[PDB]
């Protein structure tokens, strides 16, 4: 998953 | 009923097995989840959605200790505790969850997202809706208070319409910082030339  | 557990940022087969073994299920989405499990503060879309909904955000130890006990334990002792990230962002995760439990952060907001923003529009839309806001999939063409546009420099050519009718242009940090802290302060994120 991507973090922002 | 039995927990419907969402995971973010982790690969935890043991944890999933514990959820299953203790009579719970795996949540398919933040909308469906009763709990979020992760290892630390991670600003994923799932994390921000869970936080916006006010559901418990718990460490992997919750499941491991629950399996040992033979039943799901109360969440209190297992809330994610990440002082380094709390310091960096100037917030308390417990206090933000408390705010989400008391009120819908973005109720009354209508929010459009231009196409180059990160996270992208549909993911922003999930976050917005998890905070009780109204996601706008079509470009707004008239003014209303608390109707705003999330954008970025790359998308300047796409802001001519909102600029004309007086809709604020906000950086994505309005949501990325605001949802994390459970504060809605659009003034602080208005984009300058």
Short mmCIF file of C-alpha atoms in Angstrom, two decimals:
data_model
loop_
_atom_site.label_atom_id
_atom_site.label_comp_id
_atom_site.label_asym_id
_atom_site.label_seq_id
_atom_site.Cartn_x
_atom_site.Cartn_y
_atom_site.Cartn_z
CA UNK A 1 0.00 0.00 0.00
CA UNK A 2 0.95 3.58 -0.66
CA UNK A 3 1.54 6.24 2.00
CA UNK A 4 1.06 9.96 1.39
CA UNK B 1 -21.28 -8.23 16.30
CA UNK B 2 -17.97 -10.03 15.63
CA UNK B 3 -15.11 -7.80 14.48
CA UNK B 4 -14.65 -7.10 10.78
CA UNK B 5 -10.95 -6.29 10.70
CA UNK B 6 -9.13 -4.21 8.10
CA UNK B 7 -5.32 -4.19 7.82
CA UNK B 8 -3.07 -1.52 6.39
CA UNK B 9 0.66 -1.44 5.78
CA UNK B 10 1.21 -4.94 7.05
CA UNK B 11 1.50 -8.53 5.95
CA UNK B 12 0.13 -10.46 8.91
CA UNK B 13 -1.08 -13.97 8.08
CA UNK B 14 -0.95 -14.84 11.79
CA UNK B 15 -3.15 -11.84 12.51
CA UNK B 16 -5.62 -12.81 9.80
CA UNK B 17 -5.66 -16.37 11.16
CA UNK B 18 -6.36 -14.96 14.65
CA UNK B 19 -9.24 -12.86 13.37
CA UNK B 20 -10.67 -15.97 11.73
CA UNK B 21 -9.99 -18.36 14.61
CA UNK B 22 -11.69 -16.02 17.09
CA UNK B 23 -14.89 -15.78 15.05
CA UNK B 24 -14.30 -12.48 13.26
CA UNK B 25 -13.95 -11.73 9.57
CA UNK B 26 -11.75 -9.76 7.23
CA UNK B 27 -13.20 -6.40 6.22
CA UNK B 28 -13.33 -5.74 2.49
CA UNK B 29 -13.15 -1.95 2.92
CA UNK B 30 -12.96 0.83 5.45
CA UNK B 31 -16.74 1.30 5.07
CA UNK B 32 -17.27 -2.26 6.29
CA UNK B 33 -14.62 -2.38 9.02
CA UNK B 34 -15.10 -2.32 12.79
CA UNK B 35 -11.35 -2.16 13.46
CA UNK B 36 -8.13 -1.25 11.68
CA UNK B 37 -4.92 -3.11 12.50
CA UNK B 38 -1.48 -1.79 11.66
CA UNK B 39 2.01 -1.53 13.17
CA UNK B 40 2.44 2.27 13.42
CA UNK B 41 1.02 5.53 12.08
CA UNK B 42 0.98 5.15 8.27
CA UNK B 43 -0.84 7.69 6.14
CA UNK B 44 -2.38 5.19 3.77
CA UNK B 45 -5.83 5.72 2.31
CA UNK B 46 -7.13 2.96 4.63
CA UNK B 47 -5.63 4.59 7.69
CA UNK B 48 -7.15 8.00 6.93
CA UNK B 49 -10.52 6.39 6.16
CA UNK B 50 -10.55 4.39 9.40
CA UNK B 51 -9.53 7.48 11.36
CA UNK B 52 -12.24 9.55 9.66
CA UNK B 53 -14.82 6.94 10.68
CA UNK B 54 -13.52 6.87 14.26
CA UNK B 55 -12.96 3.10 14.37
CA UNK B 56 -10.29 1.72 16.70
CA UNK B 57 -6.79 1.72 15.18
CA UNK B 58 -4.94 -1.05 16.93
CA UNK B 59 -1.53 -2.73 16.89
CA UNK B 60 -0.81 -6.26 15.72
CA UNK B 61 -0.46 -7.22 19.37
CA UNK B 62 -4.23 -6.91 19.82
CA UNK B 63 -4.78 -9.99 17.66
CA UNK B 64 -1.83 -11.95 18.91
CA UNK B 65 -2.79 -11.41 22.55
CA UNK B 66 -6.45 -12.09 21.75
CA UNK B 67 -5.55 -15.42 20.18
CA UNK B 68 -3.53 -16.32 23.32
CA UNK B 69 -6.45 -15.32 25.56
CA UNK B 70 -8.89 -17.28 23.39
CA UNK B 71 -11.17 -14.30 22.70
CA UNK B 72 -11.07 -10.76 21.30
CA UNK B 73 -9.72 -8.41 23.93
CA UNK B 74 -10.91 -4.87 24.61
CA UNK B 75 -9.16 -2.36 22.31
CA UNK B 76 -7.91 0.04 25.00
CA UNK B 77 -4.45 -1.34 25.69
CA UNK B 78 -3.69 -1.85 21.98
CA UNK B 79 -4.26 1.55 20.40
CA UNK B 80 -1.42 2.34 18.03
CA UNK B 81 1.18 4.28 19.97
CA UNK B 82 3.67 6.02 17.70
CA UNK B 83 5.17 8.95 19.55
CA UNK B 84 7.69 9.78 16.80
CA UNK B 85 4.93 10.30 14.24
CA UNK B 86 2.71 12.12 16.75
CA UNK B 87 5.57 14.55 17.41
CA UNK B 88 6.27 15.07 13.73
CA UNK B 89 2.63 15.87 12.91
CA UNK B 90 1.84 17.70 16.15
CA UNK B 91 -1.14 15.57 17.07
CA UNK B 92 -2.46 12.78 19.24
CA UNK B 93 -4.03 9.75 17.51
CA UNK B 94 -6.32 9.12 20.49
CA UNK B 95 -7.50 12.73 20.50
CA UNK B 96 -8.14 12.65 16.75
CA UNK B 97 -10.17 9.42 17.11
CA UNK B 98 -12.13 11.09 19.90
CA UNK B 99 -12.97 13.99 17.60
CA UNK B 100 -14.09 11.61 14.82
CA UNK B 101 -16.31 9.83 17.34
CA UNK B 102 -17.92 13.12 18.34
CA UNK B 103 -18.58 14.57 14.89
CA UNK B 104 -18.21 14.05 11.17
CA UNK B 105 -15.19 16.18 10.27
CA UNK B 106 -16.27 17.14 6.76
CA UNK B 107 -20.06 17.18 7.02
CA UNK B 108 -21.36 20.04 4.93
CA UNK B 109 -18.25 20.14 2.72
CA UNK B 110 -18.54 19.40 -0.99
CA UNK B 111 -15.17 18.53 -2.44
CA UNK B 112 -13.93 18.06 -6.01
CA UNK B 113 -10.45 16.75 -6.77
CA UNK B 114 -8.52 17.58 -9.96
CA UNK B 115 -7.06 14.61 -11.81
CA UNK B 116 -3.33 14.91 -11.01
CA UNK B 117 -3.72 15.03 -7.22
CA UNK B 118 -2.17 12.34 -5.00
CA UNK B 119 -3.88 10.34 -3.66
CA UNK B 120 -5.97 10.32 -6.83
CA UNK B 121 -9.60 11.53 -6.96
CA UNK B 122 -11.43 8.26 -6.20
CA UNK B 123 -9.15 7.56 -3.21
CA UNK B 124 -9.61 11.13 -1.97
CA UNK B 125 -13.33 10.55 -2.42
CA UNK B 126 -13.23 7.58 -0.11
CA UNK B 127 -11.44 9.61 2.54
CA UNK B 128 -13.86 12.52 2.14
CA UNK B 129 -16.90 10.27 2.48
CA UNK B 130 -15.39 8.48 5.51
CA UNK B 131 -15.35 11.92 7.20
CA UNK B 132 -18.97 12.53 6.29
CA UNK B 133 -18.20 14.92 3.44
CA UNK B 134 -19.76 14.94 -0.01
CA UNK B 135 -17.41 13.88 -2.80
CA UNK B 136 -18.05 15.66 -6.11
CA UNK B 137 -17.14 13.55 -9.16
CA UNK B 138 -18.13 16.31 -11.62
CA UNK B 139 -16.58 19.76 -11.83
CA UNK B 140 -18.59 22.23 -9.74
CA UNK B 141 -19.68 25.27 -11.74
CA UNK B 142 -21.36 27.42 -9.08
CA UNK B 143 -20.45 28.86 -5.68
CA UNK B 144 -21.53 27.41 -2.34
CA UNK B 145 -19.91 27.84 1.08
CA UNK B 146 -17.61 24.91 1.98
CA UNK B 147 -17.59 23.75 -1.65
CA UNK B 148 -13.87 23.45 -2.42
CA UNK B 149 -11.45 22.03 -4.96
CA UNK B 150 -8.36 19.98 -4.10
CA UNK B 151 -5.67 20.59 -6.69
CA UNK B 152 -1.95 20.82 -7.43
CA UNK B 153 0.35 22.99 -9.60
CA UNK B 154 0.30 20.45 -12.43
CA UNK B 155 -3.48 20.91 -12.62
CA UNK B 156 -3.55 24.70 -12.90
CA UNK B 157 -5.07 24.46 -16.41
CA UNK B 158 -7.99 22.61 -14.81
CA UNK B 159 -8.76 25.30 -12.26
CA UNK B 160 -10.12 28.02 -14.55
CA UNK B 161 -13.74 27.13 -13.74
CA UNK B 162 -13.47 27.06 -9.93
CA UNK B 163 -11.33 30.19 -9.97
CA UNK B 164 -14.06 32.10 -11.81
CA UNK B 165 -16.92 31.18 -9.54
CA UNK B 166 -14.87 31.72 -6.38
CA UNK B 167 -14.33 28.16 -5.13
CA UNK B 168 -11.20 27.85 -2.98
CA UNK B 169 -8.27 25.86 -4.45
CA UNK B 170 -6.70 23.75 -1.69
CA UNK B 171 -3.65 21.55 -1.55
CA UNK B 172 -4.09 17.83 -0.87
CA UNK B 173 -2.62 18.44 2.56
CA UNK B 174 -5.98 19.98 3.56
CA UNK B 175 -7.16 16.37 3.68
CA UNK B 176 -3.88 14.55 4.34
CA UNK B 177 -3.09 16.71 7.40
CA UNK B 178 -6.68 17.63 8.28
CA UNK B 179 -8.06 14.10 8.35
CA UNK B 180 -5.04 12.83 10.28
CA UNK B 181 -5.53 15.49 12.94
CA UNK B 182 -9.33 15.64 12.65
CA UNK B 183 -9.24 19.41 12.01
CA UNK B 184 -10.80 21.13 8.99
CA UNK B 185 -8.89 24.36 8.33
CA UNK B 186 -9.14 25.11 4.62
CA UNK B 187 -7.65 28.63 5.01
CA UNK B 188 -4.29 27.14 5.82
CA UNK B 189 -4.10 25.21 2.52
CA UNK B 190 -5.31 27.72 -0.05
CA UNK B 191 -2.96 27.60 -3.02
CA UNK B 192 -1.06 30.76 -3.92
CA UNK B 193 0.12 31.63 -7.45
#
